[PDB]
A paper describes a structure:
Mutations in MAPT, the microtubule-associated protein tau gene, give rise to cases of frontotemporal dementia and parkinsonism linked to chromosome 17 (FTDP-17) with abundant filamentous tau inclusions in brain cells. Missense mutations of residue P301, which are the most common MAPT mutations associated with FTDP-17, give rise to the assembly of mutant four-repeat tau into filamentous inclusions, in the absence of extracellular deposits. The other three isoforms lack exon 10 expression and have three repeats (3R). These repeats and adjoining sequences constitute the microtubule-binding domains of tau. Part of this sequence also forms the core of assembled tau in neurodegenerative diseases, indicating that the physiological function of microtubule binding and the pathological assembly into amyloid filaments are mutually exclusive.
Cryo-EM showed that the tau protofilament spans residues G271-T377 and adopts a double-layered, three-lobed fold. The short arm is made of residues 282–303, whereas the long arm comprises residues 304–342. The stem is composed of two segments made of residues 271–281 and 343–362, which are packed against each other. The C-terminal segment, which consists of residues 363–377 of tau, folds back onto the stem, from which it is separated by a non-proteinaceous density. As no structure resembling that of the short arm is present in the known filament structures of wild-type tau, its formation is probably the result of the P301L mutation stabilising the local conformation at the R2-R3 junction.
Numbering used by the authors:
A (entry chain C), B (entry chain A), C (entry chain B): 271 to 377
């Protein structure tokens, strides 16, 4: 019907939508924003088997992982100006819905 | 019906949509934004078997991984200006919906 | 019906859409934005077998991987100006919907 003005400003957003879905529909394992996920799952299956013999000393000292994530600066110096004159629904106005705008910006 | 004005400003966004989906439809394993995912899953299956013999010392010291991710600066100095005069739905106006605009910007 | 104005400004975005999909339709393993994914999955299956003999010392010290990702600067100094005069739906106006615009920019 009437006039619309839509301004949308998004930065680091994440949406996940499931509309009118049937069966076993899924949205999994999503990272958005400045997100960080770290999965540290080393598996050690090293085996030492000795049978009917001599074995010396065992020094089982595996290294661990190092993981480093760094983020230094986020700055949102954002402006949204929206200057609208009018959204007027004039209806059934005999004799007139006349507009007069006068502007004098002197400097 | 009436006039529309749509301004959309997106930067680092992530959307995932499933509309009118049937069965076993999926959206998996998505990274957006300035996202970081680190999966550290080393598997060690190194085996030492000795049978009917001599074996010396064992020094099982595998190195670990190093992972480094760095991000230094995000700056959003963004402007959106939207200057609209009018979105007027004049209807059924005998005698007139006359507009007069007068602007005097003197400097 | 009425006039439309659509301005879209996107930078580093990621969309994934599944509309009217049937069965087992999937969107997997997507990276967007300035995203970083690091999968560290070395597999060690090195084996040492000795039978009916002598073996000395074992020094199993494999090196780990090094992974380095660096990003230095993101700057969004972006402008969107949208200057629209009018989106007027005049209808059923006997005698006239006359417009008069007068502009005097003196400097």
């Amino acid at each position: 019907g009437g006039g619309k003005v839509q301004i949308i400003n998004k930065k680091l957003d994440l949406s996940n939508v499931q509309s009118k879905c049937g069966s076993k529909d899924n949205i999994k394992h999503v990272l958005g924003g400045g997100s960080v996920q770290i999965v540290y799952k080393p598996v050690d299956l090293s085996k030492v088997t000795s049978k009917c013999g001599s074995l010396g000393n065992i020094h089982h000292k595996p290294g661990g992982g190092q993981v480093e994530v760094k983020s230094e600066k986020l700055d949102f110096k954002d402006r949204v100006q929206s200057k609208i004159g009018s959204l007027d629904n004039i209806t059934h106005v005999p004799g007139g819905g006349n507009k007069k705008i006068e502007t004098h910006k002197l400097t």
